Symmetry: D2
Subunit: 122 residues, 4 copies
Amino acid sequence: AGITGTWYNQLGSTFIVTAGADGALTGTYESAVGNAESRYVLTGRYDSAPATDGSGTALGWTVAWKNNYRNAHSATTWSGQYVGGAEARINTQWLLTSGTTEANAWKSTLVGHDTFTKVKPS
Amino acid sequence: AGITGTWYNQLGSTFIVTAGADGALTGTYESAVGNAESRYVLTGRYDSAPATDGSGTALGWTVAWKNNYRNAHSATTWSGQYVGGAEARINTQWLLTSGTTEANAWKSTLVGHDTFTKVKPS
Amino acid sequence: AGITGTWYNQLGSTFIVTAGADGALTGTYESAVGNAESRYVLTGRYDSAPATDGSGTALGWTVAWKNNYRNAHSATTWSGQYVGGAEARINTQWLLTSGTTEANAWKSTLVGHDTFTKVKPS
Amino acid sequence: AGITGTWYNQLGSTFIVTAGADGALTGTYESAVGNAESRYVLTGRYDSAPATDGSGTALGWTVAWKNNYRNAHSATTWSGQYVGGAEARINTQWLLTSGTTEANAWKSTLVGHDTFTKVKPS
């Protein structure tokens, strides 16, 4: 239940997600903090029966960077865990793969990390 | 879709996926070929209008490792691209995050790569 | 050299490095509290003539986790860039590979990130 | 020592390394099939007392992509393990960080993998 809702990364990106009872993640990712042409479908999965020993809840999701307005020919996956409580966060690593020719495939995939919180960053 | 169908990685895993018209990926991932207790839901996204310059098709998907037989409290995301043709492949990089305590979060995420082909490996 | 000297990550590790004139990094990495038994040799390379247009200085280094007190049969590489100024930092992503059997090689490599600053975290 | 010597990746890059008695890696990396302009210093570390249970030998090294001829303002770290025997290999994953502005730091780091063998590929 703690996953469903709006999350903000450290750079101002926004995503809104619904965590389904059986493990589905569905929602929208906005690469800005207020822009229509910047909204993309996201889908993912999470552990719907996490451990109760204080461990985080494992999850992942994907955004393909095509919407009705733009197509970057690329897709980002986020892999991480949800941690609940007063300082709730989703801590993630991500991979962003661009469609490339075979010659350029070696440089097709960027890697980074995002920390999502329930409140916007300053 | 050249994407819709069954794919095998180089280690004995398989997945079956349907690529929807507007960019959905839906299917099942089987970590051990010939073992239905190792089948898990997969969901993801792909570029439904890739570039016309011979570039690959960017995609990503997630598997949370919970089914009726197992809960590993973990999730893997695969990020990559599909290349069509006689030697069709999905070339990926993946991130496997386990739910952990805060103290153990530094070692929560494994990284690797998978190459999927339409035919089983050796 | 803005790189030469002592750096602290976000979690209580320290390293001291000398940046040589032509691009060598040499020094010691201490994973712990100020625990001498957690000190390890580090070696790496950096760009000794970075672009002077506000770009960071690319660098990388390796620690093999063997010293006189410990052998974890593993090694971490950090890849990142140095950013100078009042809020100087070395922003990195790392890969930690453990020696494994072939059967376990798929889970041999952890991935994460470290931000190093010239002052200790709170 | 089985690490010392010449290794070839899957794409026609070459490196020559000396594994020192107490864990040093020193050598040269050539990204091409031949050419002094494409040769760069490498330095790293390896586990000089690996397990004897059939496990690989953990290692890592860095190449900063500056030599007397070229400067790409970037550096690659390889993290992996050496496996000896009739099919000796060094199995790695790598991170390539480019110096960037702060605005572009999110896309500073590429990730991939290399498999090195003692004999050239195709």
